Design an enzyme around this catalytic site. Structure first.
Site, PDB file in Angstrom:
ATOM      1  N   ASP A  24       0.201  -4.561   8.693  1.00  0.00           N
ATOM      2  CA  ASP A  24       1.119  -5.477   7.494  1.00  0.00           C
ATOM      3  C   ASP A  24       1.854  -6.242   7.823  1.00  0.00           C
ATOM      4  OD1 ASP A  24       2.101  -5.305   4.915  1.00  0.00           O
ATOM      5  OD2 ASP A  24       2.904  -4.104   5.673  1.00  0.00           O
ATOM      6  N   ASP A  72       0.271 -12.198   3.872  1.00  0.00           N
ATOM      7  CA  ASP A  72       0.538 -10.762   4.064  1.00  0.00           C
ATOM      8  C   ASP A  72      -1.275  -9.773   4.142  1.00  0.00           C
ATOM      9  OD1 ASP A  72       1.145  -7.914   3.159  1.00  0.00           O
ATOM     10  OD2 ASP A  72       1.965  -8.079   1.451  1.00  0.00           O
TER      11      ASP A  72
HETATM   12  C1  5HA Z   1      -4.561  -1.026   2.111  1.00  0.00           C
HETATM   13  C2  5HA Z   1      -4.863  -2.177   1.596  1.00  0.00           C
HETATM   14  N1  5HA Z   1      -4.272  -2.138   0.612  1.00  0.00           N
HETATM   15  C3  5HA Z   1      -4.385  -2.250  -0.484  1.00  0.00           C
HETATM   16  O1  5HA Z   1      -5.647  -2.375  -1.026  1.00  0.00           O
HETATM   17  C4  5HA Z   1      -3.028  -2.918  -1.530  1.00  0.00           C
HETATM   18  C5  5HA Z   1      -1.677  -2.779  -1.053  1.00  0.00           C
HETATM   19  C6  5HA Z   1      -0.951  -2.856  -1.397  1.00  0.00           C
HETATM   20  C7  5HA Z   1       0.740  -2.839  -0.333  1.00  0.00           C
HETATM   21  O2  5HA Z   1       2.328  -3.524  -1.509  1.00  0.00           O
HETATM   22  N2  5HA Z   1       0.456  -3.278   0.538  1.00  0.00           N
HETATM   23  C8  5HA Z   1       1.915  -3.409   1.807  1.00  0.00           C
HETATM   24  C9  5HA Z   1       1.705  -2.314   2.747  1.00  0.00           C
HETATM   25  C10 5HA Z   1       0.714  -1.008   2.675  1.00  0.00           C
HETATM   26  C11 5HA Z   1      -0.429  -1.313   2.596  1.00  0.00           C
HETATM   27  C12 5HA Z   1      -1.683  -0.044   2.448  1.00  0.00           C
HETATM   28  C13 5HA Z   1      -0.990   1.541   1.711  1.00  0.00           C
HETATM   29  C14 5HA Z   1       0.604   1.573   1.410  1.00  0.00           C
HETATM   30  C15 5HA Z   1       1.165   0.123   1.700  1.00  0.00           C
HETATM   31  C16 5HA Z   1       2.254  -4.205   2.294  1.00  0.00           C
HETATM   32  O3  5HA Z   1       3.657  -4.163   3.061  1.00  0.00           O
HETATM   33  C17 5HA Z   1       2.864  -5.085   0.409  1.00  0.00           C
HETATM   34  N3  5HA Z   1       3.544  -5.790   0.965  1.00  0.00           N
HETATM   35  C18 5HA Z   1       4.408  -6.822  -0.300  1.00  0.00           C
HETATM   36  C19 5HA Z   1       5.617  -6.142  -0.507  1.00  0.00           C
HETATM   37  C20 5HA Z   1       4.676  -7.607  -0.219  1.00  0.00           C
HETATM   38  C21 5HA Z   1      -0.749  -4.113  -2.062  1.00  0.00           C
HETATM   39  C22 5HA Z   1      -2.263  -4.200  -3.155  1.00  0.00           C
HETATM   40  N4  5HA Z   1      -1.891  -4.972  -3.903  1.00  0.00           N
HETATM   41  C23 5HA Z   1      -1.352  -4.341  -5.234  1.00  0.00           C
HETATM   42  S1  5HA Z   1      -3.411  -5.347  -5.003  1.00  0.00           S
HETATM   43  C24 5HA Z   1      -4.200  -4.424  -6.005  1.00  0.00           C
HETATM   44  O4  5HA Z   1      -3.423  -6.579  -5.428  1.00  0.00           O
HETATM   45  O5  5HA Z   1      -4.371  -6.295  -3.704  1.00  0.00           O
HETATM   46  C25 5HA Z   1      -3.581  -3.367  -2.598  1.00  0.00           C
HETATM   47  C26 5HA Z   1      -5.665  -3.137   2.189  1.00  0.00           C
HETATM   48  C27 5HA Z   1      -7.459  -3.369   2.290  1.00  0.00           C
HETATM   49  C28 5HA Z   1      -7.825  -4.445   3.135  1.00  0.00           C
HETATM   50  C29 5HA Z   1      -6.986  -4.955   3.481  1.00  0.00           C
HETATM   51  C30 5HA Z   1      -5.921  -5.162   3.447  1.00  0.00           C
HETATM   52  C31 5HA Z   1      -5.193  -3.917   2.708  1.00  0.00           C
END
Ligand code: 5HA
Ligand code: CL
EC number: 3.4.23.46
Length: 368
Positions: free
Chosen positions: A34, A218
């Protein structure tokens, strides 16, 4: 760097992870990569969703720091216990470092039931490290303690795969030329966007808009998230280029899924999308262009809409990253993009990175 090539695995929508080892003897975990966060944190208790977890009692190198951490997300919350132990990446450089670890002892809506990862590797900077900037992030311990150069690059190939090249770049993973945008400030990987086109049509906004209040790169976020005011306009235009077929007004999220019989996917009623990025040289910029393929995610072939709003700023999530090889060139405080060798591309139009362009008053685009 052939050892490190293809060292990422994943499932669509579930993230990209790399295998790591922790403690002595090594415990093997899968760890989500991440670039939008700065803590290394792993499961440390038998949460039932987890294939495995760090068992601190089994490691002679484990050292307790006797301090807690509590990290809410947007939805996803975890809490853990800080320590340090010996970390290594089998398909990475042949070294071992003592890094900070947050043993995750309790969590809500963080782990994904059915996933094959147990942890998160935050690759951003101390400034946004929890509890605060004193907790040194993994990559900074890596570099301070070995000969590994201060740089890494990601090719995320949209069952998913990819490469994290630690310490360098592998020319086999991209084509054409690398173009570079400065890291505006080292906390998240913040960059400045200076122009947005849809299908070539500027959206002729103020460019302070495109970065209100941040623009960031990100790997931990699935979407291209655009600021409120930009999201509105982006939407109107992409919705206008796309008016061959109607769609629920809620599907332009978010609030629904859309469908077409498999192969029926209406690829072209959708515009390529372009972000111009500040370049290395005064008044010079370059652009990255992605397909509808990148921002239309497989979830009958029902897709979701990978663009959305944020009171957070722009988020160049994996929707962006999947088109490119992205080099996080921390040593020179810059980020580089090249067309990816593995991106999904039809025969009519492909992702692109081009320049130079002339663009004035680029400094004026950074929200302050
Ligand atoms: C896992 C999945 N992430 C997701 O699908 C997904 C994850 C996040 C999320 O907050 N991810 C975290 C790490 C983080 C990672 C996993 C679990 C918890 C926290 C990351 O540090 C966020 N960084 C932001 C603070 C700057 C946010 C969202 N969005 C809100 S979105 C709907 O607008 O797309 C989608 C994913 C799928 C494919 C590729 C990358 C990530
Ligand atoms: Cl340390």
């Amino acid at each position: 760097f052939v050892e490190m090539v293809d060292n990422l695995r994943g499932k669509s929508g579930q993230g990209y992870y790399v295998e790591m080892t922790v403690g002595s003897p090594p415990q093997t975990l899968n760890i989500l990569v991440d670039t939008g966060s700065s803590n290394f944190a792993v499961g440390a208790a038998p949460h039932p969703f987890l294939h495995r977890y760090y068992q601190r009692q089994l490691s002679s190198t484990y050292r307790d720091l006797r301090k807690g951490v509590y990290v809410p997300y947007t939805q996803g919350k975890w809490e853990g216990e800080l320590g340090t132990d010996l970390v290594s990446i089998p398909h990475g450089p042949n070294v071992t470092v003592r890094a900070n670890i947050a043993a995750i002892t309790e969590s809500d809506k963080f782990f994904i039931n059915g996933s094959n990862w147990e942890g998160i590797l935050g690759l951003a900077y101390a400034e946004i490290a929890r509890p605060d900037d004193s907790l040194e992030p993994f990559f900074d311990s890596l570099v301070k303690q070995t000969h590994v150069p201060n740089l890494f690059s990601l090719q995320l190939c949209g069952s998913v795969g990819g490469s994290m090249i630690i310490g360098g770049i592998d020319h086999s993973l991209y084509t054409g030329s690398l173009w570079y945008t400065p890291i505006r400030r080292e906390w998240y990987y913040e960059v400045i966007i200076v122009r947005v086109e849809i299908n070539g049509q500027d959206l002729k906004m103020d460019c302070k808009e495109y970065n209100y209040d941040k623009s960031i790169v990100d790997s931990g976020t699935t979407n291209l998230r655009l600021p409120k005011k930009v999201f509105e306009a982006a939407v109107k235009s992409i919705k206008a280029a796309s008016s061959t077929e109607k769609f629920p007004d809620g599907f332009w999220l978010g609030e629904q899924l859309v469908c077409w019989q498999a192969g029926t996917t209406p690829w072209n009623i959708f515009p390529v999308i372009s972000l111009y990025l500040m370049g290395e040289v005064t008044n010079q910029s370059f652009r990255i262009t992605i397909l509808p393929q990148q921002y239309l995610r497989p979830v009958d072939d029902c897709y979701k809409f990978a663009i959305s709003q944020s009171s957070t700023g722009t988020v160049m999530g994996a929707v962006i990253m999947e088109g490119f090889y992205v080099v996080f060139d921390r040593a020179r405080k810059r980020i580089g993009f090249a067309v990816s060798a593995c991106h999904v591309h039809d025969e009519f139009r492909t992702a692109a990175v081009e320049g130079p362009f002339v663009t004035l008053d680029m400094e004026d685009c950074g929200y302050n």
